[PDB]
Every structure is written in structure tokens, then in C-alpha cells.
Ligand binder design. Structure first.
Ligand code: ASP
Ligand code: ASP
Ligand code: ASP
Ligand code: ASP
Lengths: 325, 325, 325, 325
């Protein structure tokens, strides 16, 4: 009796197709279904009983919070069933920073939720998709993968949704977390778990979007030399509920950024100072406005802020989420 | 006789002072003069004859293109003299991604221009400033450091202005370049050069800002899920000459980002697609609008685009600069 | 009432002194007592009630298994007392791969055992010792640091004794674990735990050396092109109980290395195939002799094998230790 | 017309064939000829005119100095011809630390010598071989690859033979150089060179093996706690010409290692102190015996020492080679 795994497809280059096998970038992309991905890897039949389901068919650069609501609700419906042991989600790499972390806070089950992607299309020479999908299903079918939070599997690595991000624009090994490493690795058709996420996730999370139809809008504004104050004005004008600041260094604000953040806060907008660096802690500073993002990236900080605004508008409670989640 | 090195001060945590040494973050920053930094390390006298100038006294988060013009003009004025062998620039870490790369394209000399910074204030326990400054002066005083482009010295490393960036928000070893490494290292009071910059820099650069009073305005717009098109509308309204897109993955645009970029291009604004990932190549794509940033980060792409706009607005010529510089 | 922390000194460059402050390497090293290190950082009094003890005064390159036995028995006696909350151990960096992992398997307490070291002597410019010691004591005094296994603190990082190793010969940031990251970080006088060790350690470990006078001899033989078979003959002649093979790639043996290992196994010597690469999994292979080291480095594999030989010689039980510890 | 590239096969997992595609490790390895590798990638015909030769059919773990001597002589006579523009060498990954660096010092031409390997067998799911081979041939056929030293191409990276090493036992992205990065990358069917090797290589190298029948024997002895002195006695007994010490930290010797090295030096054996860390500089120290390996790893130090012993035994001259090569 093999485990029962459901593969939910949302699109991405993993389900992409090009005219030539030498083409990995800059091509008229064609989408493939979940059944085509399953049929491409007949070795999945030794791991688990597989059922395919197409949630979406878009590039992750076009992934929206509305589709994330639909995805999370469907994952929760499936994991509540006794005939589903785990869920594998085929997704694009461009916003694989956000999607798994969204599910890390919204999934109400200990059963494995494994995001999977590919940097090369299925038609490409040495396409990474087939092995990544094999690894993802293997992880989801393993009972030892439970209670570890949402997992992300690419290039023989098992990364945490809380730390893993696309660190390189175009390489196969792009998904890394320099300061936190990987939760596990897949070597020689065997899973080796090494670390556990020391943050609040899945079953112990207070965030629930089961009865949420629309999430609060949150913008991300970059921090740099000569950064305009008018970007904050644009966010205020359109009435966003939150703003994540991709700050210079440890979330440092310029005179124009400081003025823009305080103007947003006076209108009731919750601002969180993250970092454009790529990793590390943004420490508390009473001399600067806004909350701090802890070690959360601008992309993941936005996700947490959106979900935090569904529960509260209290800055201290939201700050507590950033240090715990 | 010893070489003649001039230390130009712009500010930063390297010249920062706190009431307690346990404080490294969120403190009352006390700005120190260039002479105080020189007197703190009397071992600089064994390396070279030191002179100090105070170009600026601000945090790098407030570093502007106007101050960079003043800095670049002063560096070129000093390096043209026979009594100056090299220059050391004490700067902050928050925008040390931009400043050195600016001078990497504007300095008209093979003489060493070495940027130096510190993550911990001078008062802090195990302050990195003193050793960083010693290493920077040592690098600038070495004649073998010539013709290598603008250098950045922190944590015993010599990084290229073209590749090095603050990769972590709060650590001493934050300045890294995972795909390109370091040009050299400083170990045991000795310099070990290992790699050379294979890009156009300094003397061979066509970018000259000697007769430039004001640089063209360039904004950076971040790429993420549900990214607003109105950010581009804000840039267009304020009449920016360039827009750098910190794209999802390999500079991928959403439907709103695509619309915002094409709207900017119709107004004559040159848009360059960079990446929010942290490293890697953004490959050319005819299916997407805007130019491609090659391996240049959003911060450095903005610097190059700003300087490219002083000479031309032609997309093909600017694209050529992005692959060469 | 502040926690009671005991600082045990074994030596190292953290307690080293040079002729000049520009000397970090190649000098006549002097020794500093445990009290000299404590008085150098008066900020330790705000963290905990400190009591220093001098266990040894040697370079870690000369650290032996006999001294580790004495250290482990002493730590166990200290932590068994109700008036001790944690222990900080000043040690050298050269064999900081072995020592903490030894205590990770032998210390029977949830109370923090924090190893600390320095890459620069206390006399050097921007000596890392003072801050590393401050960070180590802060970790040991924190109640949240309990039950996390043996910790290693340098350069604002909290690494696991199971994963952390000296990855660079001479840099301050040398202690890394690319595949596993850090358990926590120390930023802005605050501790941020991110991951937990998912292996058997400390309290749950079966390795008890309280009644052990002398440990079994284990050698490490390197794997390379034209590697001699006579090195294995030298180990067999001296009657070692174990041999760790620092293998090429994934612990691959040459024809001479295969012959040497099989000859050792016939004499009752338990051989474990590790890797010279620096990281990763050495997978099981029925076509090759010896056991596999999992992700354990040659240095750490020797430590585990040495402790495993005090309990059993059964290859199946020892292999189970390598996948669980 | 297209360039003329010769592919020299030595063996390895790139030419490996397993029973099942889920088998990447621990399998009965099969041997695939050079023509089988060429016919597997028909896209090589668009890059260059290909001719294949079978130099060897062994795993790199069994690669010997006599085969490297034969390989180097064959590469040199091929590059001397006008009908050969570059050479691609299919090799194993286990000793890809040594082989390319050997040729980096022995090749007497600016024509590209590109080593290529694969972590997964040709039969495996998402086998890296085909893309790596395509990338290697593309690099060898590119005129811009000339005068850059021996290149190593895997996972879309172009690494220098001087710096690149297998850093992980079992992953696709194993070939890294933390402190030096890559010379270039292959993204979207385009080569992007970023750094150049700032060491003496190929054409300018003084190490000629045209008239060498047998290379001097050089052993590598590992440095660790309780390291035996008898390993050095075994090397002296068999009359090796050199000994590379894989030292603890920055090549630090124990009391037994110090006694063993000085005993080797008294018998005329040249000893070089390298590091077991994985990267970094081993600094000169008059207080310790033996020469220093600079930034060279134990594997690469052995290669340089072996080639230096064909010319001289003078300690100061060999030490100079270690800082220049
Ligand atoms: N544009 C693609 C990139 C990828 O999947 O690799 C996506 O994110 O859907
Ligand atoms: N806020 C400081 C940060 C630093 O220098 O470390 C600056 O950039 O000026
Ligand atoms: N030789 C020293 C190196 C250090 O501590 O940095 C030791 O390990 O004791
Ligand atoms: N055992 C193989 C490993 C590989 O090529 O991946 C070899 O080096 O030949």
C-alpha cells in the first residue's frame, strides 16, 4: 500500500515548452498540464499513488493573492481527507519566495505540502523538472516529512518556506538560504533530514484564510540612493493597508524614505522595514519609523503583513508575528 | 620613501560613535572626523604618508548623486597630481553597492581608489573599522593594486566595485559576490590578488562627469506578486529619465509591470530589467519590454543607467554598456 | 539574579598575544589566562555571574582525546550542579571541528555548552575575541538556548557542533555550514534562533564516557590520485580500532584505497568512508568496502567512530549511529 | 566555418550507465565510449566540428599521474596543430580538483582546454551530462575563451582550474570556489565572462612535462587531533619526493606533525603545509617547518609540488611557485 499524493499544478517553467532544446531563456512559452508532467516521470508510480489537479496555468510572475487564496483553501480541503497523505505543488520559480511562505502560514495540517519548480523547460537539455518532481513526490510520500512546515524541493534540496529564496536569476542551484541552509537533502534516492524550522508554522499558526475572499493590499518600495518620496504617495493614494520597505542595509531609511513612511503611518498604513541585502536581521530601532522584518525578505514580509492585517492593525501584535513567524 | 595616500571621508558607521560598546544597532550616531579615524590607527604611518579630507559627513543611506559628483571630481583632481599615489574613501555600508561602482565608471586613473566601511561603530566591542581602514590603506599604497578598477575593502577582502554588495543586513562578512568572488584577500599583513575584473572600468571607461552638474533621475521599481502599475505612473509623472526594474527571477514582468514599462518606454524613458534575486544573469528576451541588466544588481544598474543617460538615450547603445561595464 | 556561567579555558588564539597589533599570523605566541579574557570584556557582568577556570593552555592543533575526556567529565559535573546554568569553553579554531562535536555526544545536560574562539589574537587590531566571548556568554546565559545541543559562537553566529566547521584557513567568518546554515544569530545585542538540530544529541545520546579512561585510536587517511596503500598498513600495524577515509568525491575509493580498507576490515578495524569535499552526503554503496559517514566530515566522523567503538564493534550499529547522530 | 574541437575521453560518471534511472549513486557502473557521448547531444554540430578520442576508460578516483602525463602530452600535440582550435576533456568529478590544475601548469597553448564532468549518470533522471558537455564544447569553440587557463564546466559555470573544487560529495552544483567565484557563466545559450585568473598559467607556465617519463611521488597526510607521526615515517620509508600536509586551520602542525615534517625535511623531502578547511590562505610562519600552500588545496598543492620537483628541490624557489601559480 503506497501513499496517496495529490499534485496541484499552477504553471511555471516546470510545465513550459520551447521550440528548441537549447532554448532555456527568451522563448515563446507553451504550457503543459499536470498529467503531462506525471506521464513524463513514470518512476513516480514506485513512490506513491498519484492524482493530478490543475489549479492554475500561469507563470509565477503573474501569481496573485487571489489564486493563493484558492490554492490554500484547496490544500486544506485535500489534507483534511483521510485518502490524501501529502500535496505536491508545481509552481514557477519567479515568485516561489512568496507562495510557499503563504501556505506555511495558512495550511492547517501537519501533512507535507511540497512546492516544486524547474529552472529549465521540459524540452530543454538536462531539464531539471523531472528529477525535482520525483524528489518532491518522494518527500510528500515520506511520513518523516510531517510537521516541518511547507517544503520547497529543487536541485536535490529540501528548503523551508520561511527561509528559501531564488538567490540567482538563472541557475539550477538558485534556491538557497545562506544563513539557514536546508531542512534536508535528497541523495541516492534517500531523504536526509538535518534541520528543523524554529518558527511558528502550519498547525500552530493563527492565520486562517478559509473565510477570506480578498486580502489587504500591500506594496513593496525599494530603498536606494535618491529614492523618491512620491512612491509612498502613490501607495497612500491607492489606499494600501501595508507597505514593506526593501531597505538599504539593515532597513535604513533616507530622509525621503523616512518622510514617506511617516506619512503612510499617519494615514493608518502599517509599514515594515525589510532589507534589500538578501539575508540577515533588521534590528529594532526607535530612531526610525515602521516595524522591523526580523530576517524576513521583502517578498516574504509582504506575505506575512497581508495575513497579519486580516487579524489586527495593532503594530505591536504585528511586530510579534515578525519575530515568531 | 612611503607612498602618498589621501583619505576622503563621507561618513558612515566607520565614523560612528555610541555611548555603549554593546550597541551596534539602533543608537545615537556620533559623527567622527577624518583626522580622528587616522589617529585611531597609528599603524597607517608604516604604510604611507596620510592626508585627510572631509568630503561629506552623512550616513550612506542619505548618499546622493550630487555628493557622488563632488566625490568623483575630487578623486580625479587628486589622482591627476604626482603627489598622490592612491585614495581611500571611508563610506557607509548601506549604499556601498552604488558609490564604488559610480567611481568605477567615472575615475580617469589607474591609481587605486579603495572604498572602506565598517559594520560596527568605532566604540563597539571588536569594532571592524580599524582593521578595515588598515587593510584599505595597505591596498591603496600597493602599486600592484593599480589598473584593477575601484576596490572595496572590508573583513580582509578586496572586492570589485562591479560585483561586491552588502548581502547581509547586519553581519561583518556581509560584502560578498557568490558568483564572482573577491579580486584579492588581505591575510597576515600581506595582499594576495587572485582575480581580475574582466569588464571595462576606470581609464578605459567612456563615462565622464567632470562637466556634469546634475545627473538624470532614475527610479527602481520592485517586482513581486500583485505589483502595482501605478508605481510606473508615478515615475512617468515626475519625468525620470530611467527606470530600473528589480524583477522577479530573471527580470520577469507581470502583466501590470509589462504595461508600466511599455508606458514608460513610449515616453522616452529607458527601462532596464534587473533582478531581485541577488545574483545572476538577466538574459535578453524579445518577448519582454525593456533592456536587460546582465549580471548587474538593481542598485548598480541604476548607477550605470544614470551615467549612460548623460551620453545617450539609445536602447541598443545602453544595452551594449550593460554587457561591457 | 543573573544566571551563573562557568568559563572553561583550553587555550587558542583567543587567549593569544603577538609582538605587534598588525600581527595576526606568524608570530611568537604568548598565553593569556581565563581571568585576563574576562576582565578584557567588563560587559560580561551585565549578562551573567562569571566564574573562570583554566582547564588547559594549548593550541587546538595539539588538543588530544585524553584532554577531551577530562573536559567532558568536567562539563558533566559542572552542569549537574543546581548553581550552574551554562558553560562557555574558550578553544582554538584549528580543531574546533572535533571538540564541540565530542561534547555534543557526551554531555548529558540540556544546559548550554557554548564553544568560543577567535581568529585574531587579543592584541591584534579589531580582535574578534572580545565580541565572540560576549556573544558566547550571552548565548549560555539565555534560557532559550537550552536543549539545542553543543553550540559554537564566532562572528555573531551560533552554529551546531554537528554541522559547523572551519571552512577557511584565515578569515573571521570561517565557521560556516553551507548545507545546514546556523542555528541562530546574534544581532543588536539580541539572540535570534532560526533552526534546530534534527539529530540525536546531548541528553538523548547513548555515548557515555564517564567510566572511560582511554579512547580507541582512530586515524584519518586522505583520498587522492596515486594514494598509497601503505598508509593503511601503518594504521593496521599500530592496532587502531577505527579508520576514517577522507574520500575523493562521495567517499570513492581507488584500487589502492579499496585494498587498504579491505585489509583493515579483515583485521577487525571498522572503516568509515567520509569525504574530502567539505560537505554533502556519502551514500551507501554495496560495491565499496567500509561504512558511510552520511554528512559527517572526516574530523567529526573520527569523533563519532571513536565514541562508537567504546560501546560496540558491530558495523550495523555503528552505521545506525552515523545516520542518527 | 565552425571551429575544430577534439573531445578526449578519460571516463567518469558522465560516461556512466546504470540499470535504473533512479540510480544516481551506489550502482554497477557501465562504460560509454566518446562517440556515445557525442551522438547523445546532436546539438554539438551547431557549435563545432567534433572529433573524439578515448584516452582512458576509468573512474577519476583511479586517475593516476602516468595517465595525466599521457593526457598532457596528447593535449599539447593536438593544440600545436593548426586544425585544432580547442580541446574538451570528459573526466570524472572525484579528482577533478587535480586533473585540470595539472594541465593548467603543463599546457603550452592559449587554446581552450575545457574539462567537463557529470554528477549524475547518462541514464539518470535529469542527467547533467548532456548540458555540461554542450556548455564545455561551446566554451572551447568560443574565441573569447582563449588565454584564460584551463577551464572546468559544470552546472552552467566556467571555473578556473586554479580555484574550482568539488565542495559537496553528491550535488549537481558541487563545483564552487567560495573566495574566487567563477571566471564566467553560461546563461541562455550565451557565455558571460566576468573574472580572469591572476596567476601564472598555461603558456607562461615553466612546468614542461614533454620530457618527463615518470612524475615524483607525493603523499598527502591529513591534520587532526591525535594525528600519528608514523604516517610521515611511512612516506619516508617509501622514498617520496614531496609531502603535502592537509593542516588543521591555517596549516597548523601538532607536536607529532611537527616532528614528522622535520624528519621528512632531514631526508630531503620537500613538505608543503596546506589546509583541510576548504579555502583560504596558509600564511608564512618561521615558527613552523615546511613551505606554505598559499590558497592551494591539499589536492592542488600536491599537483604543483609534484611538477615543481621535476625542476628543482630548492625550498625558496618552490615557495615562490606556490605564490605565483
Ligand atoms: N517565468 C517562470 C520562471 C520559472 O518557473 O523558472 C515562472 O516563474 O513561472
Ligand atoms: N547606516 C550606516 C550603516 C553602516 O555604515 O554600517 C551607513 O551606511 O552610513
Ligand atoms: N593555532 C590556533 C588557531 C586559532 O585559535 O585561531 C589554535 O587552534 O589554537
Ligand atoms: N566515481 C566518479 C564520480 C563522478 O564522475 O561523478 C568518477 O569520478 O569517475
Amino acid at each position: 500500500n503506497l501513499p496517496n499524493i495529490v499534485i496541484l499544478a499552477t504553471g511555471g517553467t516546470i510545465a513550459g515548452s520551447a521550440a528548441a532544446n537549447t532554448q532555456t531563456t527568451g522563448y515563446k512559452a507553451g504550457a503543459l498540464g499536470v498529467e503531462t508532467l506525471i506521464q513524463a516521470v513514470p518512476e513516480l508510480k514506485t513512490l506513491a499513488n498519484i492524482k493530478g489537479e490543475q489549479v492554475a496555468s500561469i507563470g509565477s510572475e503573474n501569481m496573485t493573492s487571489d489564486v493563493l487564496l484558492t490554492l490554500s483553501k484547496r490544500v486544506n480541503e485535500l489534507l483534511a481527507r483521510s485518502d490524501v497523505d501529502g500535496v505536491v505543488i508545481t509552481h514557477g520559480t519567479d515568485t516561489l519566495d512568496e507562495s510557499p511562505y503563504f501556505l506555511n502560514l495558512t495550511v492547517k495540517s501537519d501533512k507535507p505540502v511540497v512546492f516544486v519548480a524547474a529552472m529549465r523547460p521540459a524540452t530543454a537539455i538536462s531539464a531539471d523538472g523531472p528529477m525535482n518532481l520525483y524528489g518532491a513526490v518522494k518527500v510528500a510520500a515520506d511520513k518523516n516529512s510531517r510537521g516541518r512546515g511547507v517544503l520547497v524541493v529543487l536541485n536535490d534540496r529540501i528548503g523551508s518556506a520561511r527561509f528559501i529564496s531564488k538567490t540567482n536569476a538563472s541557475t539550477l542551484d538558485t534556491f538557497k538560504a545562506p544563513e539557514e541552509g536546508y531542512l534536508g537533502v535528497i541523495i541516492g534516492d534517500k531523504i536526509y533530514y538535518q534541520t528543523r524550522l524554529d518558527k511558528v508554522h502550519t498547525t500552530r499558526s493563527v492565520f486562517d484564510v478559509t473565510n477570506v475572499d480578498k486580502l489587504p493590499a500591500v506594496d513593496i518600495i525599494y530603498g536606494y540612493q535618491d529614492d523618491p518620496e512620491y512612491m509612498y504617495d502613490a501607495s497612500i493614494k491607492h489606499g494600501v493597508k501595508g507597505i514593506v520597505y526593501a531597505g538599504m542595509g539593515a532597513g535604513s531609511v533616507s530622509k525621503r524614505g523616512d518622510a514617506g513612511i511617516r506619512k503612510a503611518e499617519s494615514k493608518g498604513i502599517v509599514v515594515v522595514r525589510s532589507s534589500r541585502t538578501g539575508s540577515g536581521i533588521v534590528p529594532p530601532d526607535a530612531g526610525q519609523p515602521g516595524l522591523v522584518a526580523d530576517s524576513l525578505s521583502p517578498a516574504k514580509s509582504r506575505i506575512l503583513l497581508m495575513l497579519a492585517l486580516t487579524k489586527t492593525t495593532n503594530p505591536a501584535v504585528i511586530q510579534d508575528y515578525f519575530h515568531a513567524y
